[PDB]
Amino acid sequence: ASPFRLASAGEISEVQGILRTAGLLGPEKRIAYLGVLDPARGAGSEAEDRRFRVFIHDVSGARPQEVTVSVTNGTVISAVELDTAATGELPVLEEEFEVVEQLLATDERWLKALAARNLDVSKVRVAPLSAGVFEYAEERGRRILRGLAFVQDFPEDSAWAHPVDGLVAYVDVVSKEVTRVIDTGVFPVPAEHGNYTDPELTGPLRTTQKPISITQPEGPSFTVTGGNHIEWEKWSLDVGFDVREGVVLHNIAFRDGDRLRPIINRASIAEMVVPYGDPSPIRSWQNYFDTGEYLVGQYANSLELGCDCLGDITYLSPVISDAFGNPREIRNGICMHEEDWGILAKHSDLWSGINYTRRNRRMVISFFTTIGNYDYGFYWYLYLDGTIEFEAKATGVVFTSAFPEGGSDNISQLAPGLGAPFHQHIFSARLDMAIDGFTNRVEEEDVVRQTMGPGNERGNAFSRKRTVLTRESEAVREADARTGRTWIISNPESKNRLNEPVGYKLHAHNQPTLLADPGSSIARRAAFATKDLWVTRYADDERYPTGDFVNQHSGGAGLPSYIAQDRDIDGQDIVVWHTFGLTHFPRVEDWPIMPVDTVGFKLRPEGFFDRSPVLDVPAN
Amino acid sequence: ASPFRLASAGEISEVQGILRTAGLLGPEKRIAYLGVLDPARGAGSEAEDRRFRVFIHDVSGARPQEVTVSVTNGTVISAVELDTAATGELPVLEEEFEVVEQLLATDERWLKALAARNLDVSKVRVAPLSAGVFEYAEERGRRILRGLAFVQDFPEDSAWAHPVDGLVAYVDVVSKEVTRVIDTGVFPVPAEHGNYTDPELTGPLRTTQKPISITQPEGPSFTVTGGNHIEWEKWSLDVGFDVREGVVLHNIAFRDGDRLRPIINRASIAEMVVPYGDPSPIRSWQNYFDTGEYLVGQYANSLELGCDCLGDITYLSPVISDAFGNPREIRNGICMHEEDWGILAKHSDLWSGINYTRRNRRMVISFFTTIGNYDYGFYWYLYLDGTIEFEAKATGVVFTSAFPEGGSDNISQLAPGLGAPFHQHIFSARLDMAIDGFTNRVEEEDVVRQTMGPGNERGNAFSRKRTVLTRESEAVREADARTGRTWIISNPESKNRLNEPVGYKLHAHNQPTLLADPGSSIARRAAFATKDLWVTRYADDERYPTGDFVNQHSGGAGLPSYIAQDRDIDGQDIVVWHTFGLTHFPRVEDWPIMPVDTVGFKLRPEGFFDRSPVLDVPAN
Ligand SMILES: [Cu+2]
Ligand SMILES: [Cu+2]
Ligand code: NA
Ligand code: NA
């Protein structure tokens, strides 16, 4: 019955059928994006209307369409032709990934470049890389991918060990033409292999790890109903999945006594970008919007038990559309489990004689995706004490280049002749807040140092200040770790027993934001990534910090355009957009396969509850 | 055989006997501190000399002594009378904790203050609190504790719920005299109880938590030999214990192929301080040096299985001296176990067809201590990939006050009439570095932004810079989160296969440092806490950032005095001292018992290895 249930195979085939019936999905049409829309505000009173949004590409060169379908009613709600030169190209299609290498393999310029390097064309892999927006006028309105080459010595070889530097090509994937081949000169192709399953490189595998067994003899403490509604240790939520964003959490709420108290209406990673910091023309255009351009949900891994996810795991297997509108299941694509999280609370009191210890646990909801060389784990955590956390785990194989003779200020050395260009991985979490309901506001809280003098004669006092962000023009904020800056989302109309507005405090990691010059293309296309915190007034069409169409799309849409409306956010339905990222100067230890590194944020209750919410946790 | 083995009961009784035989431990003497000394540099060639350092208090008012004993040889090496007014008072004695309440209970001023508040003296608990150094000339050279009162309604009541504000007393614990009783006026004593085991407050305990079972059917993957030598997944170390510092790690090294490579020679928390930010004269003197004044090791909890430590646990039971020199075991005072730590590395490669996943684990070495209302867990972690981490977990009951009518800039409200003064918990980790041996140096690494222009035409480039800290005068450093500042400890004479100096990078959390005015007593006594990173040249007598005697000791010793020597630290035997802390504005959720909050740091290999050190980790 829930309007927040996962899309079923049946719903996707029905969208296909409705589109077909309406003349919108003939043999030249391809689905570049398909997802269910969230219910409108206040729609719980009315009956279900499951609506799906679809981006339809045309392989014959016709203009694409954005379409909204009511699968409940079997109707097309709206269909509009897109002018991609204006509003952006559609996301990269799975089927286009092979096309760059295939077209290049019979191009005389490409073949000349490979021959100059004595490389067998049959062994040259070409990465299908998003193009962005630079100085090439002919690309405007065209679907372009750029190709960088990597040699694969044999079918099971890791091509990433053998980058072909000094060479890049641009391809029109619709007209199937190579537009440019740029050869700045030969670099040595690094020769050492990077095969992390080859016994010659690993050596004898360790025999020293004894098993760790994690079981739940009575099963898990969470329940799953209606396919994707979770109840666990007072928490209530619905686990959604979208082909762009991946796992999306809806209706995060906490049962405090008899009352189900909303906290977050929708939580997602609404964008992620990987900007590269190498000024070589071979890579200086490189910025991968994994979410917006590639769609991270689409590439979610099937997660194997006792391997990717350990313990008593409950899986969801979300369904997505293929390019023709047929349903495709991602088997075991979402892991759900609870785990022990050490000590929750502890005190041994001298005066009372009472010794007290309680254990913590967390509910974990995760998926893992692969985008070329990169693999990312997205983890959401709910804790007994009311804390909500997100963590991204970055691994995979580092994107490589040649390491220049005489070194580099923008590339590190991994192996003889092998370089790794500096880059960032920067995420945007979109938190549609609902602290005790939708009437919310945000304050920036700084620590306040005090001067020794009257009222503070010993020079020990310190304090804090809170500044309400009243309108969108004032709600673009930066970190200040030195002053312990955080942001509190409160409900000014809902007070705790001490007559204080209930709230949650966002604790950021205060990692560097986007490093690129403010006049660059990437600073404009990923403007969200230049500041740590944005607050907007909720609107149903303000979904992504980069807008709906990121691929080959200049600035003009996304967060900078949203906040220009300068709307009231002081006790209104608001959305927090938190930028957080990793700045990566690759180390030798990252090669030939990278150990996980992490980044994230959390929110902790701040006068939300009337006392600790975990007094009723039992011993042992 | 190891000179780094834990002290045995026999060694402590032997120190007692040697001191007795030498005339240094008659019936009026009390041991305030006793611990084993680390071996001297280059002492591995010579036979064992187990030496113990002892601080001896005299209850008859005679001057205390600092004594070094060779337990191996049965001799007193050195004994020196201390002038405490100059060099500091000895640590607070366990036996002094009851004395403040006992003396106050028959003092007419104290009794008058309690009678003004209608409080039964038999119900008034008095916390024995360190005094620090303020404006009271008569305290110089005297052992003083200050007392703050809390009412206990019945034997099992949590007194912390019932602070008696407006009242403080000062007591000479040797002469057994009350020096001052200060009553600034009556405040209401908060009436609600804070009894977190009372069913009336907890409500019915949850029945929803299903068991989680963590077992190791073949046992743990680590070995323990010689009592305290750990070998685990290429790591090698010795787990020490000291009554002041608690768990101390020695000889942290990693077996890389055939070579045992040192990383850290000694790691400890060498100080921790809890400064309060309430300018009321009742608490404005409050700064608890839990390590330096109270000795955190002394109060280590006995940790219960399946409760404090979960899984297949190996315990150490360290032995300490009581006040008379008799050995006392802290049963199960140190937990050691390994645990699963999610995904280590993962890649699913399109071109090779190879899908690869490996799991991480960490070795955990921990203890938990209780200092009055506070309880702290100290956790050291070693990871498969070479990462070393420390985490402090803070819990217990918040230190309380009245909440003033009309509010406070320096105190938060927890319950009706109940306040919690703002404070910090600030730790100093002393890391005696040995990156591939003792010849080490530290660089500060900042991210470097670059301007769009020639050489960077697209405005995408970014870089980094490293600054070697060459001498101690240049090695007092602050955080800069915005520029991604870290510190790399390298060995300039030990190069990896890429001809780069091997190293480890310290990643701080960049939390605020000491907030107090720079002219305060606490800014001088805890000078270390004002800056994030200090580097010194190693010396055997530079043990604590606050010096040997912290109790009632002004500035003059510790880190500021050490670095004045301006010694060479560029390719020398050096020590890194990292300040990190929590700034606590207590929330209603912290009452009546605080959920754990955490702070820490980690160090990751940075070109230490020639490639990933976890290629030989097996599947599943
Ligand atoms: Cu990276
Ligand atoms: Cu605290
Ligand atoms: Na909202
Ligand atoms: Na050293």
| Run of H or E residues at A147 | strand A144-151
Distance from C-alpha of A268 to C-alpha of B413, rounded to nearest angstrom: 34
Euclidean distance between CA atoms B237 and B240, whole angstroms: 10
Strand order in the sheet with A411-415: A401-402, A418-421, A411-415
Whether A343 sits inside 8 A of B377 (CB atoms) is yes
With a CB cutoff of 8 Å and minimum separation 6, the contacts of B335 are: B303, B308, B309, B313, B314, B315, B364, B365, B366, B367
Cβ pairs bridging A and B (under 8 Å):
445
Q: For residue A358, what are the CA distances in angstroms to A295, A344, A362, B306?
A: 41, 5, 14, 11
Query: A253 phi and psi, to 5 degrees?
Result: -145, 160
For the record, the structure tokens of B406 come out as 């009309």
Q: How far apart are CA A155 and CA A158, in angstroms?
A: 9
Pick from B574, B580, B539, B571: nearest CA to B558: B539
Contacts with B213 from chain A: Cβ below 8 Å: 213-217
- Could you tell me the distance, in angstroms and rounded to a whole number, from the CA of residue B245 to the centre of ligand 2? 20
Resolution of this model in Å is 1.8
- Give the H/E segment covering residue B113: helix B108-116
Annotated binding residue at B226?
A: no
Chain A residues whose CB is inside 8 A of the B601 CB are none
For an interface test with A, the pick among B92, B193, B282, B349 (most A C-beta atoms closer than 10 Å) comes out as B349
Token pair for B504: 């480890």
| Residue A217 CB neighbours (<10 A) | 9
The secondary structure of residue A290, as a DSSP letter, is I
Closest by CA to B266, choosing from B253, B257, B255, is B253
Token pair recorded at residue A582: 């990793």
Geometric angle at alpha carbon B304, from B300 and B307, rounded to 5°: 115
A416 to B498: CB separation less than 8 angstroms, yes or no: yes
Instruction: Compare CB distances from B310 to A204, A359, A373 and report the shortest one's residue.
Output: A359
Integer Cα distance of B161 and A167 in angstroms: 71
B315 is catalytic: no
Query: B117 CA distance to ligand 2 centroid (A)?
Result: 28
Q: How far apart are CA A281 and CA A391, in angstroms?
A: 33
CA pair distance A312, A308, nearest whole angstrom: 12
Q: How far is A216 from chain B (nearest CA, A)?
A: 5
Q: Which long-range contacts (CB under 8 A, 24 or more apart) does B44-51 make?
A: B44/B3, B48/B1, B48/B3, B48/B72, B49/B73, B50/B3, B50/B11, B51/B77
Of the candidates B276, B282, B275, B284, which has an alpha carbon nearest to the alpha carbon of residue B168? Answer: B282
Q: Looking at chain B, how many residues does it have?
A: 620
* Nearest-Cα residue of chain A relative to residue B507: A511
Closest CA to B367 of B431, B430, B421, B298: B298
Burial of A137 (0-12, 13-18, 19+ CB in 10 A): exposed
CB A39 within 8 A of CB A359: no
Phi-psi category of B161—alpha, beta or left, where left has phi over 0 and alpha has psi -120 to 50?
Answer: alpha
CA distance B400 to chain A (A): 15
> Per the residue annotation, which of B170, B374, B381, B544 is the catalytic one?
B374
Minimum distance, in Å, between the CA of residue A519 and any CA atom of chain B: 7
CA distances from A282 to B134, B258, B453, B478 (A): 65, 41, 17, 38
Return all residues near A571 (Cβ < 8 A) that are at least 6 apart: A439, A440, A441, A492, A493
Q: How far is the CA of B411 from the centre of ligand 2 (A)?
A: 12
Q: Which residues of chain B neighbour A343 with C-beta distances below 8 Å?
A: 308, 368, 377, 393, 395, 596
Known binding residue B57? Answer is: no
Residue of B125, B136, B212, B507 to mutate, testing the A interface (most A Cβ within 10 Å of its Cβ) = B212
3-class SS at A263?
A: strand
Strand A355-371, strand A374-383: pairing: antiparallel
Number of other residues whose CB lies within 10 A of the CB of residue A455: 10
Residues of B in contact with A97 (CB under 8 A): 350
Give me the residues paired with residue B393 across strands: B377, B598
Strand partners, A534: A476, A577
Distance CA B323, CA B469 (A): 44
Closest CA to B226 of B207, B251, B206: B251
Q: Which residue does chain A place closest to B460, by CA atoms?
A: A516
B145 Cα–ligand 2 center, Å: 22
Q: Which residue of B has its CA nearest to A220?
A: B210
| Substitution target from A151, A612, A617 for chain B, most B beta carbons within 10 A | A612
Cα–Cα distance, B430 to A139 (Å, whole number): 58
Tokens of A502: 């209930």
Q: How far apart are CA A596 and CA A598, in angstroms?
A: 7
Structure solved via: X-ray
Asked whether A507 and A601 are in contact (CB, 8 A), the reply is yes
- Measure the CA angle with vertex A263, ends A258 and A267; round to 5°: 140
Residues 6 or more apart whose CB falls under 8 angstroms from that of A258 comprise none
Q: Is A368–B343 a contact, with Cβ atoms under 8 angstroms apart?
A: yes
Q: Which positions of A are catalytic?
A: 290, 374
Of the partner residues A377, A481, A618, the one whose CB lies closest to the CB of residue B343: A377
Out of B157, B242, B290, B436, the active site residue is B290
Neighbour tally for B113: CB within 10 Å? 23
Cβ atoms of residues A344 and A324 within 8 Å: no
Listed in sequence order, the residues at least 6 apart from B120 whose beta carbon sits closer than 8 Å to its beta carbon are B114
- Please give the domain boundaries of chain B with CATH numbers for all domains: 1-87 (3.10.450.40), 94-195 (3.10.450.40), 196-619 (2.70.98.20)
Q: Relative to the alpha carbon of B540, which ligand is closest?
A: 4
Say how far residue A166 (Cα) sits from the centre of its chain: 31
| A248-254 contacts at long range (C-beta below 8 A, 24 or more positions apart) | A249/A365, A249/A380, A250/A4, A250/A38, A251/A4, A252/A382, A252/A388, A254/A386, A254/A613
- Binding positions of A for substrate are 288-299, 371-376
Listed in sequence order, the residues at least 6 apart from A609 whose beta carbon sits closer than 8 Å to its beta carbon are A256, A386, A496, B588, B589
| Residue B379 CA, ligand 2 centroid: distance in Å | 18
**Strand positions, DSSP E, B349-437:** 355-371, 374-383, 388-396, 401-402, 411-415, 418-421, 423-433
What is the A401 CA–ligand 3 centroid distance (Å)? 44
Cβ separation of A368 and B346 shorter than 8 Å? yes
Cross-chain Cβ contact B307/A593 below 8 Å? no
Tokens (6 digits) for A556? 């003009």
Of B205, B210, B618, the CB nearest to A219: B210
Ligand 2 centroid, distance to B586 Cα (angstroms):
7
Contact B410 A352 (CB under 8 A): no
Number of other CB atoms surrounding residue A134 within 10 Å: 14
- Asked whether B57 and B30 are in contact (CB, 8 A), the reply is yes
Kindly give the distance from the C-alpha atom of residue A146 to the centroid of ligand 1, in angstroms, as a whole number: 20
Taking the CA of B374 as reference, the closest ligand is 2
Q: How far apart are CA B168 and CA B610, in angstroms?
A: 61
Q: A451 vs chain B: nearest CA distance in angstroms?
A: 6
The Cα-based distances of A32 to A93, A140, A243, A298, A551 in angstroms read: 6, 19, 10, 10, 12
CB contact under 8 A, A351 and B218: no
Determine the residue among B303, B351, B520 to mutate to test chain A binding: the one whose Cβ has the most chain A Cβ atoms within 10 Å.
B351
| A463, A290 contact by CB (below 8 A) | no
Ligand 3: distance of its center to the CA of A537 in Å?
A: 8
| A607–chain B nearest CA distance, Å | 5
Q: How many residues does this entry show for chain A? A: 620
Contact A609, B589 (CB under 8 A): yes
Whether residues B212 and A209 touch (CB distance < 8 A) is answered with: no
Q: Do B534 and B545 form a contact (C-beta atoms < 8 A)?
A: yes
- By the 10 Å C-beta count (0-12 exposed, 13-18 middle, 19+ buried), A80 is classed as exposed
User: In sequence order, which residues have a C-beta less than 8 Å from that of residue A205 and are 6 or more positions away?
Assistant: B616, B617, B618
Measured in degrees and rounded to the nearest 5, phi and psi for residue B121 equal -55, -30
Residues of B in contact with A276 (CB under 8 A): 460
CA distances (Å), origin A155, targets A158, B347, B350:
9, 16, 11
Q: Is B576 annotated as a binding residue?
A: no
Residues of A with Cβ-Cβ distance to B346 under 8 angstroms: 308, 368, 375, 377, 395-396, 596
In the block, residue with structure tokens 């009554």: B243
* C-alpha span between A406 and B493 (Å, rounded): 21
3-state secondary structure of B610: coil
Q: Would the CB atoms of B463 and A410 count as touching at under 8 Å?
A: yes
Question: Alpha-carbon distance A527 to B482, whole Å?
Answer: 17
